[PDB]
RNA sequence: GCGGGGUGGAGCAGCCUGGUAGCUCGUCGGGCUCAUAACCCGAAGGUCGUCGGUUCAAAUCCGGCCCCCGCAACCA
RNA sequence: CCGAGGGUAGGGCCCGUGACUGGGGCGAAGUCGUAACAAGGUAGCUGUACCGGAAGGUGCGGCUGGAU
RNA sequence: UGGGAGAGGGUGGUGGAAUUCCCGGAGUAGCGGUGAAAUGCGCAGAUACCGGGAGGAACGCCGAUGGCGAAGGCAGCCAC
RNA sequence: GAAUGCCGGCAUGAGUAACGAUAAAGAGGGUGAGAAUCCCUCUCGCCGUAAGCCCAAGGGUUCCUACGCAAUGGUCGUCAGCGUAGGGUUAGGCGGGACCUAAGGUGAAGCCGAAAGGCGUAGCCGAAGGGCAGCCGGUUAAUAUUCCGGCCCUUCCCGCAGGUGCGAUGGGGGGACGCUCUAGGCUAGGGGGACCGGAGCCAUGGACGAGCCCGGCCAGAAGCGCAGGGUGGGAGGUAGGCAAAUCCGCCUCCCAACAAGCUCUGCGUGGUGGGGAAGCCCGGGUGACAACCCCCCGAAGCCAGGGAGCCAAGAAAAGCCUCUAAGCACAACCUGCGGGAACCCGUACCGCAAACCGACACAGGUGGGCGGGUGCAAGAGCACUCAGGCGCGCGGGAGAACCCUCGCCAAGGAACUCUGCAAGUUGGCCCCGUAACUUCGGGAGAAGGGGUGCUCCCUGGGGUGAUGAGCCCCGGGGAGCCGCAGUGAACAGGCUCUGGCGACUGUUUACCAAAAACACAGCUCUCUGCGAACUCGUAAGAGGAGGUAUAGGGAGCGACGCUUGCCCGGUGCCGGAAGGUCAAGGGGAGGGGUGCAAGCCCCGAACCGAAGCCCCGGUGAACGGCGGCCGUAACUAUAACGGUCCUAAGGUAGCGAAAUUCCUUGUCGGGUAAGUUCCGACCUGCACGAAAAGCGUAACGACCGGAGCGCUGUCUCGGCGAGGGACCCGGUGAAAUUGAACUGGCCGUGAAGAUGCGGCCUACCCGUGGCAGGACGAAAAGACCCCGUGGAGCUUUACUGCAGCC
RNA sequence: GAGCUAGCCCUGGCCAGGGUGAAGCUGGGGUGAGACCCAGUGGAGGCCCGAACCGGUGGGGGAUGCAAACCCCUCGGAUGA
RNA sequence: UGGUUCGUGGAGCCAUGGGGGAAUCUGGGCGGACCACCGCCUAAGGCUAAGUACUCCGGGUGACCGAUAGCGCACCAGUAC
């Protein structure tokens, strides 16, 4: 049957993307966090 | 003059629909019309805030002129009369005899291409806006300001019509469509007449297609809700409501009254509502 | 299993707060009426379901026994 | 080919009968009240409506076939 | 062709009397109702009196043993 | 040494289940160390509104070529979406950006919030919507509307010519719109041709034929032609379109009008450029100087912003046109022509799937376009088949039980069973015919029945064309032929009678309930006078609504018909300027502490003092409630009538053993041979009853009852047959489970149901196919029950607070 | 976190073919004029049959599945809420 | 109402949301209600090293671990998945 993930580009960048990130409170603290742990992506990868 | 149909479906049964008599033009002045923008209940929040909105048909908002003094002393003709979805009442299309278009709300008996005026001096006739200081005692009246200058405000309803009782200092004595007995500033424009399309009361939806039509979602009772939703939810099988019939939000909804006391304009009602 | 009842012929007070049995109807005698009823004047009839106890004294307070309605009998 | 009639299916009229049910006629001495005939003790009758154990009552309008 | 009487009918308008209700005034111990009462209303100011307002219905006197209509029926006043 | 412990390793089950759609394979020839599995050829089967083709999304090199086979591939592998390497994606016109706006988002002004932040006009962002200039063929191993060829077009810059009051982010026009139905003429697409072109063919009994087989076009600027869309002209006045205006709007006048003209688009033609089959021979060459014509069918697409009707009344902004303002009129703009200039990103391949979403090369899910032919009434249905694409990545045998899916069956025909569950039957079209009841529509495909192929002859009407031939579309009559059978295969209702519930079409527990539940038009009560009530928010602000009592919120009831009785004592709500109570505050009789004293300091009575509560009323489609005992009639029985107690008042109409009746299979009647169900009645209704509505109701229902006809493998009662498994052989090879095991019956015993203890009995060692009685077999630390001063949802006249409101 | 799912908002798209035959209009009849009746035209509808598409009624299978909801037969809606 | 040891307590002190509202030393605050006396201090402006805390970083040292330990990572780890 239909199943829950369904990719979307342009869903995916406005959504988890950089910019969606930075212009929230609780956005920057996950970049913060993410920096801080060292992620190699702070960001979900997406072609755009 | 309600059209009926013959039952050729379950629905066309009982089905009732307005006849269109008066109406002699079915596409809106163009320069008069802007999108209206549907809301499906919902404020600014994103939040329902009216329960059971949304999916009615498409619309264009007409821009009706609420404000005749205006164009004191300017004649207009009555150029159309016009079907208008977002009120009860059939609009008129004005030419102006200053070239300008506007629309009024149409009262019962007005006819394509006659005059109509407004103003101090304007003749006691149907489709003229005076303050209401002018209007003879007696009078019907429709479209009134409550306050000047602010906007028609009173009365706007299909068929409805308030009646001027009398006079006292700046204020003048209105019976409103309710029934209340309210004092009304002098000033206050008003229409001389009533709205028109009163035969509007009597027509039968007919089915839930048509609800749905005129954006209206159906309605779920609180009897057959679950506690979590609403004081009459829950109960095993049927429940009458065992406490005094409230709304989902607690409060009692037989009786209870809602105004507030301490209210200003309690110094300008005279009698509470009829019926 | 828990609850309330049993008192002139009928239907109900009095029982809690021990000593005092009361109300309407009915019944019996008289009256009015041609006569009956209605109505008026008089009167009689209960030892309080029963046995046992407390008491100076029990319809009454406490215990059985007989009876009468009433409520309950759920989870599998 | 037609054809007595037999068969399948569905209709129409009549008669008889049916748990139970509706009122009706009748029947020497049952129970309840007293509606009508006297102004019958609320004049009566009436079409209709609503109500009531029952006769009946009341409303609206009508008739005199109503007394004084 | 010329005349007349009439609550004949339909429509729109409109006049005063009375009842009820509402606001103001003035005023006090009862009002109402019946065969007699009681229910009811009244010191939270009723009834009775005066001014104001709202609303519906029916048209006193003329009026008659009268008039009109086919019958049922038709009565303030005005116009069509 | 144990913790259903943690991590890792290795066992058992076991050479067992399985190897992922039952569309299907066989042979020959190649390659190679090795071949059912790779390549080629022939034969066979499967899809063909796809299982073919083109987009979009998502994926991200998977594309092409060479070289490889350890792992990946459910077997194999020489093959591959796999390993290694090299190559491959070309745009002014296609899509997006340098254009526009939608919801929404953001947000100079402004507003609000302890902080963080929340709002918000304009503006800006935002698309699969608007706008905007490229079609046909060729070429590569792999890209092509991109490269090439032919023929066309757009914008920008500069220049020349002609013309004009030029000029705007401002004014105006336009853009610009729904649903259903639909005209004319076209194009896409298709059928046929005795005409035109073509390699060839004559078989096996016949045919050298007006034979068979193949093909018979695509694009195109100006001009022209056919069909459409759009659009009146001039003048005078003018106070409106937030400055101006010659524009637009309004008034008058003349002329035009189902036209014409002007303009725009589609189609046809069109200079020109392309393409071009079978068959043979080796993707190519030939065929070929290929021919390229006529008739018919014909769109849902085009002309288009067409026409009609209806009510539920159907985006914006830019491009574009017109008007003018500053300004400037050496300018500037419009038109024609010429030269120059024209950027960034995507483009491979997969794409109903082995490359996307499902852990898998997973029978599942995934939006748009094309989707041929014949026949069946039509069609995207069904059967076969074209182009194209496949046989589904384990095979070979055998011919057991049993399972699955399928076919038939003597006589009977629901006797099966909770239930005709299931499976039969019926089945399309044309004609005949069709009941109760009904809201007059319906019920209705009621029911039931007749017809249906092929051949010859006669004839009626329509479309195209020409009025005719031809082709195509509806028919009518007569005579015959064959079979068991003519919708001859495939697709395609079983019907009737009678109850309950719900009016109806709809909606729901994604994944055990589709229903009588929810919704629904309709009825009623109630709140709300507008800065509405109500809702979300601390607020600002929103919704309500750019609505205004014929409106908006809340509540119950639930089409429609006939109806909806009595109780206001309690609770609720509503009205009541009195009275009672009443907090902070006011008031200060009267005290008190301290000081030498002025004083400073504390307590404090009467009395004035809101809402709320008390108190007086009203109010039921507000919460709710609507009795008991005893007696009585000239047979009996039963009580129309009476007595008395109690209540706020004692259940009315209608209905009733019911979706409600305990006793109960009540009792009587119906149906049956027989009826705990069913239907009709009766009424001592344990425990119906009137908007948590009462009693009915035509139509409707994948709802739940009961009966009958039809027909059947449901059954008596089973039999046979088919395929896929199971079985055997080759290849690959799991699982839960498992204290260890050398693991029998009876009767006893034992913590009370023993392979394991006692006594007896029985038993050579080891497997394979089967069956399920036991191993208190497996799975899941019972979901029932209880216990825990364990938790959570929910309720209220439990307690205590808080929002909100007064 | 609303790329699943529920509701709303904006903007696009889709629904083979066949059946039934409302109003209106026209003509005829009728009447003082009407109502109304008949025929033709017309093409309405939470109308009817049935694909696509949306569902999920009954049964069978599947149950360490092809599948953590699937498969086969049958069945509901299909111009509308 | 908060702070303090102070939970309304005999409840001062410090701070302050609301109302009332002075004085300039003969002014004003405090010494735990309040009063007297006796003392302490000078509010409603502001700045100020050091001694104190911490360890991303560097070094030194362990009756610290020694690859299931020691950081999650001794190794291309905040990676693969
Ligand atoms: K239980
Ligand atoms: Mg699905
Ligand atoms: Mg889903
Ligand atoms: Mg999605
Ligand atoms: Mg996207
Ligand atoms: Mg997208
Ligand atoms: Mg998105
Ligand atoms: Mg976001
Ligand atoms: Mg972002
Ligand atoms: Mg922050
Ligand atoms: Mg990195
Ligand atoms: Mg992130
Ligand atoms: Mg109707
Ligand atoms: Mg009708
Ligand atoms: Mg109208
Ligand atoms: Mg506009
Ligand atoms: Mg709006
Ligand atoms: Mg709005
Ligand atoms: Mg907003
Ligand atoms: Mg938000
Ligand atoms: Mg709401
Ligand atoms: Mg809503
Ligand atoms: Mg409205
Ligand atoms: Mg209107
Ligand atoms: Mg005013
Ligand atoms: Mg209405
Ligand atoms: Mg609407
Ligand atoms: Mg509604
Ligand atoms: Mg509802
Ligand atoms: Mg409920
Ligand atoms: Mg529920
Ligand atoms: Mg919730
Ligand atoms: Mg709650
Ligand atoms: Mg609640
Ligand atoms: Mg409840
Ligand atoms: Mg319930
Ligand atoms: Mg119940
Ligand atoms: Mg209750
Ligand atoms: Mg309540
Ligand atoms: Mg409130
Ligand atoms: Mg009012
Ligand atoms: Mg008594
Ligand atoms: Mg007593
Ligand atoms: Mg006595
Ligand atoms: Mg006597
Ligand atoms: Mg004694
Ligand atoms: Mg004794
Ligand atoms: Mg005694
Ligand atoms: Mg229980
Ligand atoms: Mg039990
Ligand atoms: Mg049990
Ligand atoms: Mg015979
Ligand atoms: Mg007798
Ligand atoms: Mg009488
Ligand atoms: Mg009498
Ligand atoms: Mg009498
Ligand atoms: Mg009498
Ligand atoms: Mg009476
Ligand atoms: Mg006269
Ligand atoms: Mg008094
Ligand atoms: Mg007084
Ligand atoms: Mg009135
Ligand atoms: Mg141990
Ligand atoms: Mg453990
Ligand atoms: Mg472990
Ligand atoms: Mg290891
Ligand atoms: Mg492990
Ligand atoms: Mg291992
Ligand atoms: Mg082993
Ligand atoms: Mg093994
Ligand atoms: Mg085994
Ligand atoms: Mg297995
Ligand atoms: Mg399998
Ligand atoms: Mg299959
Ligand atoms: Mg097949
Ligand atoms: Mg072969
Ligand atoms: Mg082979
Ligand atoms: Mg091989
Ligand atoms: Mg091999
Ligand atoms: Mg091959
Ligand atoms: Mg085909
Ligand atoms: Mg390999
Ligand atoms: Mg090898
Ligand atoms: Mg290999
Ligand atoms: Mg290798
Ligand atoms: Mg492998
Ligand atoms: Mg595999
Ligand atoms: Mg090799
Ligand atoms: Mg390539
Ligand atoms: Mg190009
Ligand atoms: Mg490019
Ligand atoms: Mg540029
Ligand atoms: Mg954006
Ligand atoms: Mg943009
Ligand atoms: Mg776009
Ligand atoms: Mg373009
Ligand atoms: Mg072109
Ligand atoms: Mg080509
Ligand atoms: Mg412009
Ligand atoms: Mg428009
Ligand atoms: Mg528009
Ligand atoms: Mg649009
Ligand atoms: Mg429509
Ligand atoms: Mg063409
Ligand atoms: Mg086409
Ligand atoms: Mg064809
Ligand atoms: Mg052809
Ligand atoms: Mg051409
Ligand atoms: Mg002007
Ligand atoms: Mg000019
Ligand atoms: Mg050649
Ligand atoms: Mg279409
Ligand atoms: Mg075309
Ligand atoms: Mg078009
Ligand atoms: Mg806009
Ligand atoms: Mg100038
Ligand atoms: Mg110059
Ligand atoms: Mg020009
Ligand atoms: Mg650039
Ligand atoms: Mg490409
Ligand atoms: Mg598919
Ligand atoms: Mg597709
Ligand atoms: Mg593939
Ligand atoms: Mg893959
Ligand atoms: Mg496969
Ligand atoms: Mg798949
Ligand atoms: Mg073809
Ligand atoms: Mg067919
Ligand atoms: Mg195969
Ligand atoms: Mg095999
Ligand atoms: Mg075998
Ligand atoms: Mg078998
Ligand atoms: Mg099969
Ligand atoms: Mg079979
Ligand atoms: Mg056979
Ligand atoms: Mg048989
Ligand atoms: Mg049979
Ligand atoms: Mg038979
Ligand atoms: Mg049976
Ligand atoms: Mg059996
Ligand atoms: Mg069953
Ligand atoms: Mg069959
Ligand atoms: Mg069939
Ligand atoms: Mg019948
Ligand atoms: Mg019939
Ligand atoms: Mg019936
Ligand atoms: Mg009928
Ligand atoms: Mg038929
Ligand atoms: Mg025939
Ligand atoms: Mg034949
Ligand atoms: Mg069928
Ligand atoms: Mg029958
Ligand atoms: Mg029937
Ligand atoms: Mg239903
Ligand atoms: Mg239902
Ligand atoms: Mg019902
Ligand atoms: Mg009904
Ligand atoms: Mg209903
Ligand atoms: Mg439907
Ligand atoms: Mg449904
Ligand atoms: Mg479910
Ligand atoms: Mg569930
Ligand atoms: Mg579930
Ligand atoms: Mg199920
Ligand atoms: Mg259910
Ligand atoms: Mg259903
Ligand atoms: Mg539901
Ligand atoms: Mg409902
Ligand atoms: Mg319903
Ligand atoms: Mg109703
Ligand atoms: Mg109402
Ligand atoms: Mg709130
Ligand atoms: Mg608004
Ligand atoms: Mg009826
Ligand atoms: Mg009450
Ligand atoms: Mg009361
Ligand atoms: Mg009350
Ligand atoms: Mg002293
Ligand atoms: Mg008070
Ligand atoms: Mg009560
Ligand atoms: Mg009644
Ligand atoms: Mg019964
Ligand atoms: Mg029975
Ligand atoms: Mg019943
Ligand atoms: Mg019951
Ligand atoms: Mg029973
Ligand atoms: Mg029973
Ligand atoms: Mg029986
Ligand atoms: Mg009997
Ligand atoms: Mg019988
Ligand atoms: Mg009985
Ligand atoms: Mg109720
Ligand atoms: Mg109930
Ligand atoms: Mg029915
Ligand atoms: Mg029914
Ligand atoms: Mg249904
Ligand atoms: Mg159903
Ligand atoms: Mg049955
Ligand atoms: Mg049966
Ligand atoms: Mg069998
Ligand atoms: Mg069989
Ligand atoms: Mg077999
Ligand atoms: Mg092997
Ligand atoms: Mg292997
Ligand atoms: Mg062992
Ligand atoms: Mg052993
Ligand atoms: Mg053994
Ligand atoms: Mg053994
Ligand atoms: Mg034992
Ligand atoms: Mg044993
Ligand atoms: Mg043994
Ligand atoms: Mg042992
Ligand atoms: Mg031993
Ligand atoms: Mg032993
Ligand atoms: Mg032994
Ligand atoms: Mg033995
Ligand atoms: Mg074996
Ligand atoms: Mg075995
Ligand atoms: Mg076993
Ligand atoms: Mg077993
Ligand atoms: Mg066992
Ligand atoms: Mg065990
Ligand atoms: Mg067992
Ligand atoms: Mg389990
Ligand atoms: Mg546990
Ligand atoms: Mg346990
Ligand atoms: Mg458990
Ligand atoms: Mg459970
Ligand atoms: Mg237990
Ligand atoms: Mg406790
Ligand atoms: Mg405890
Ligand atoms: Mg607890
Ligand atoms: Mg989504
Ligand atoms: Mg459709
Ligand atoms: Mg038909
Ligand atoms: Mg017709
Ligand atoms: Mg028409
Ligand atoms: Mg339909
Ligand atoms: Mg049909
Ligand atoms: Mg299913
Ligand atoms: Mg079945
Ligand atoms: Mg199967
Ligand atoms: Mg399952
Ligand atoms: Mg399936
Ligand atoms: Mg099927
Ligand atoms: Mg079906
Ligand atoms: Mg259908
Ligand atoms: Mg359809
Ligand atoms: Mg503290
Ligand atoms: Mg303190
Ligand atoms: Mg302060
Ligand atoms: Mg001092
Ligand atoms: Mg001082
Ligand atoms: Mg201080
Ligand atoms: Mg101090
Ligand atoms: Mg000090
Ligand atoms: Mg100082
Ligand atoms: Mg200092
Ligand atoms: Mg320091
Ligand atoms: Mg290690
Ligand atoms: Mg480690
Ligand atoms: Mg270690
Ligand atoms: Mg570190
Ligand atoms: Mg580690
Ligand atoms: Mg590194
Ligand atoms: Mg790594």
Redesign the pocket.
Known sequence: ?????????????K??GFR??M??????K?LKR?RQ?????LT????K | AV?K????????????????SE?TK???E??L????????????????????????????????D?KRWD?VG?PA?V?AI????????RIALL???????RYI?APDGLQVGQQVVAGPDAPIQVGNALPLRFIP??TVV?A?E??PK??????????????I??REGDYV?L????????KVHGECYATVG??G????????????????????????????????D??????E??????????????????????????????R??????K?
């Open positions: 049957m239909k199943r829950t993930w369904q990719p979307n580009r342009r869903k995916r960048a959504t988890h969606a990130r212009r929230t409170p609780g956005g920057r996950v993410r742990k060292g992620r190699w992506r979900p990868a997406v072609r | 059209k149909f013959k039952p050729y479906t379950p629905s066309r049964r009982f089905m009732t629909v307005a006849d269109f109406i079915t596409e809106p163009k320069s019309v802007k999108p209206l923008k549907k809301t499906g209940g919902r404020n600014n929040q994103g939040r329902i805030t009216v329960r059971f909105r949304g999916g009615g048909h498409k619309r264009l908002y007409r821009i009706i609420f164009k300017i003709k150029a016009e079907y208008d979805p977002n009120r009860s009442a030419h102006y005899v200053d070239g300008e278009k709300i005692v007696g429709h009134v409550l306050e602010k906007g028609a405000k009173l009365a706007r309803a299909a068929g409805t019509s308030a009646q009782q009398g004595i019976r409103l469509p309710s029934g209340e007995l309210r009533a709205v399309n009163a035969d509007h009361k009597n027509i039968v939806l007919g089915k839930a297609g048509r609800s749905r039509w005129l954006g209206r979602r159906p309605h779920v009772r609180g009897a057959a809700m679950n506690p979590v609403h004081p009459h939810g829950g109960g099988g049927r429940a009458p409501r065992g406490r005094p019939p409230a709304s989902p939000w607690g409060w009692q909804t037989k009786g209870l009254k809602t105004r507030k006391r301490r209210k200003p304009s309690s300008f009602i005279i009698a509470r509502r019926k």
